[PDB]
Amino acid sequence: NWSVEDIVKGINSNNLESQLQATQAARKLLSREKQPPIDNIIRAGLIPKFVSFLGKTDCSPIQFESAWALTNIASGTSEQTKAVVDGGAIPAFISLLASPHAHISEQAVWALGNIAGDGSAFRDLVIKHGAIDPLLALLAVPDLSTLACGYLRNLTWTLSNLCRNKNPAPPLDAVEQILPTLVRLLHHNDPEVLADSCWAISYLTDGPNERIEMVVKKGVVPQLVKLLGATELPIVTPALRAIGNIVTGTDEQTQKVIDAGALAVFPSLLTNPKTNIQKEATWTMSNITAGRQDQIQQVVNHGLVPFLVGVLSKADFKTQKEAAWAITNYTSGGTVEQIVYLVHCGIIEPLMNLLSAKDTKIIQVILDAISNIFQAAEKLGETEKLSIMIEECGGLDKIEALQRHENESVYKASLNLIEKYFS
């Protein structure tokens, strides 16, 4: 309970013990969570003094207090984090990584995590200051279980922030440096180390297929699928995001996910009570149905087509939109037999019900998939059966209303459908 004025008096006393006590008082202020006076500390000019205290190896308590106080300033807005970086804090924290006191180096890990967590530029600036070598050297043990639990959690989280963000993605040559340690943490039996490694892996698998392949040749897909079946939601969420990211790549990268048994988990995920899980799982299914015909057959074999029909029937609208994408990719790449099976599972009525939705893109996706199914019906000569089928569940009513509204592609596809099969 000091005032900022008193903290400034203690900091400028040029008395090391007074500075230590004022810095601890500043740390206590900055560590209350309902409105800490970050901007007041910054406007007082205390940040350069705090950074200079980081290098007083003779007084390790003032190192710890300054690190904690700077950590909490860097936890705020980008302007407040910039203030920490502008005071030269990055090379000082990187030096503290080599502190013989675990709590001090742990706090340097936390601070660096907050700075890299601000965005691409600060993450890249932390890497350019050489933080990766000493960070990974803290984990250079044969068995991670010998490390302190909170110590390990803090390193994993800071490493996940070095793998985070795009425009630009992290330097490949630093991802290569981090990946082996990341795989090691991914096999570590701690739910929060597991969750943070999965986040890191999900970040690294977002973007070009080259970066997807870079994660995949480390063998993490079986572990990702194992973690996909976890009961802890904070583990499944990033795990499913990583799996979903991987199946956006090549057909071989998608097959590696299928070969790991991932499809067996999806009856759970597609009926998950958490909305984003359902949405992510359905988006993943849409990208798997955009694969080869043998991969669409794997979806059929695992009995997931009734689950896709259910998501299309009753789900969050965002989830339903991903279901519409899954059906259009299915009907676009599937065999006539796979399409026949899809219609036999009862896809028509839930598909027609979403033609009244107030979203232009989903009508495009749905009307497209209707064209797809009709194109298969022509190879069976049974276009009349599909006509009466769309008849019998209020379908043509929707398509002849969609025949005339604003968007160009919808009514062009609408007139086409009407002239070609309903006359």
Binding site: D206, G207, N245, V247, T248, G249, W283, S286, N287, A290, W325, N329, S332, G333
Partner: peptide, 6 residues
């Protein structure tokens, strides 16, 4: 039939 990326 195209894969959608995030």
């Amino acid at each position: 039939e195209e894969k959608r990326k995030r």
